[PDB]
Write a protein that binds this ligand. Structure first.
Ligand SMILES: O=P(O)(O)OC[C@H]1O[C@](O)(COP(=O)(O)O)[C@@H](O)[C@@H]1O
Ligand SMILES: O=P(O)(O)OC[C@H]1O[C@](O)(COP(=O)(O)O)[C@@H](O)[C@@H]1O
Ligand SMILES: [Ca+2]
Ligand SMILES: [Ca+2]
Ligand SMILES: [Ca+2]
Ligand SMILES: [Ca+2]
Ligand SMILES: [Ca+2]
Ligand SMILES: [Ca+2]
Lengths: 252, 252
């Protein structure tokens, strides 16, 4: 498979996935209807999203890692896919939830070759191949923010914070693309329990990085050997190369 | 003026402002075109939105008090306009921003008769009148949650809180409707410096107060004395009857 393929497939699934949900009333979205392989409940939207996202990516040959359905496939290539990031927003009809496909030639994040987040309430499009990162056709790049008094997104503020502004929108995938295009000066998942799964942020990272971004763990060590498995989880700090050492500093 | 006019007018305003703001690209949008008469910079979006509002507003026998031009009008019907709160999100393509309006038969909140707040990005039209709270033409109502383990919109999480989750979309006016409609169970703007201004809170308080919401200043004082001008500031502890007093202590 090629990085051109991933778009092709990512865009099919995005369209399919968007519509299934578009036609599903908020009353219908919020009903729990099962429990996921991830060990969390399944909402009705989640259900339809998966099934849509999974009718396509099963037509292909990959090893796709998902929530409701666990690890399926034998494929050479691994896809960390979430067909509806921010279910609570969707369930609410609050327009911050997307599809998030991340493909890799190997088992680890290091061998990522395409990232793709699509807002299914807006139809906004974020992806990145080996030729940059884009927000709907035009290429993106992070931000020259040099100091901490900056517009940041954080999970979760616990005390005094120098930031120009903080935000929590409810879609870490989406959010990580908010960073990537200059909207925010960083992303922060500092939740000591470490509660971000690979399908949760694998993509978002990739594009942020492709947009020129310092995206690491709490210790600033690489994320490269993160796993397309269900038990993989991560904390996240992301900013431009020159901001990072301070927030690293800062929250240390 | 009566409840039905205001609803028509409001709709009117939302119309052009949406047409107006939607034509502008982020790049023009984020332009610092000058200074609003409230002590903060006017971005072109701000000016464009406020522009097309007053065009529709000051033909009416009403006094207006708004972010950019301040107080302007000649009648006893007071209006609390924010032609676009969520400017930040508006200049970076974040679909949570709205024009807010509230009409009163005096310059005190306690004489408001109309509450209108419209998600300029998605078309979510919230509103309040005698008949009750509506959303996209559908009666709405605050949750019924009674524990501290809720979904909390808060300015700001200065510490460890017991909430089940924290969100901050960065538009009061619309985030009050996520509580009004009970999409979230509680809206807290407990910024130490009384930061919120009348045109951020008027439509929201009324709309949510009508949704069943119980809405008070930080300490619990009634907001009915809250006056329609350029200098008031508000803290806001909104929550259903059962939850509200719980919060008045937790933050104490
Ligand atoms: O939804 P929570 O658990 O309150 O916290 C928000 C975080 O968890 C997630 O919402 C999890 O994703 P979901 O929408 O699929 O549940 C992240 O997107 C976000 O970063
Ligand atoms: O952005 P801050 O200064 O951190 O404070 C949050 C405030 O942002 C605001 O959206 C500002 O309003 P504007 O976007 O219309 O200027 C308020 O609604 C909210 O109360
Ligand atoms: Ca789930
Ligand atoms: Ca999900
Ligand atoms: Ca997720
Ligand atoms: Ca301003
Ligand atoms: Ca404003
Ligand atoms: Ca404002």
């Amino acid at each position: 498979m090629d990085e051109r393929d991933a778009l092709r497939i990512s865009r099919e699934i995005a369209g399919e996935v968007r519509k299934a949900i578009a036609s599903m009333p908020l009353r219908e979205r919020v009903k729990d209807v099962g429990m996921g392989k991830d060990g969390t409940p399944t909402k009705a939207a989640d259900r339809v999203a998966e099934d849509a996202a999974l009718e396509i990516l099963r037509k292909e040959r990959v090893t796709v890692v998902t929530e409701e359905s666990g690890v399926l496939g034998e494929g050479d290539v691994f896809v960390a896919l979430d067909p509806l990031d921010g279910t609570f927003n969707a369930t609410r009809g609050i327009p911050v939830y997307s599809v998030s496909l991340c493909f890799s030639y190997s088992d680890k994040l290091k061998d990522a070759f395409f990232g793709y987040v699509y807002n299914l309430a807006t139809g906004d499009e974020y992806y990145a191949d080996s030729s940059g990162a884009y927000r709907n056709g035009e290429r993106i790049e992070v931000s020259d923010a040099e100091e901490l008094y900056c517009n940041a997104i954080i999970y979760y503020p616990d005390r005094k914070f120098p930031f120009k502004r903080m935000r929590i929108f409810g879609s870490a995938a989406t959010e990580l693309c908010f960073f990537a295009d200059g909207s925010f000066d960083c992303f922060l998942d500092i939740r000591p329990g470490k509660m971000l799964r690979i399908y949760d942020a694998a993509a978002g990272v990739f594009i942020a990085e492709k947009a020129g971004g310092k995206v690491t763990e709490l210790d600033g060590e690489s994320l490269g050997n993160k796993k397309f498995d269900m038990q993989e989880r991560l904390n996240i700090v992301a900013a431009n190369e020159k901001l990072h050492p301070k927030l690293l500093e800062l929250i240390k």
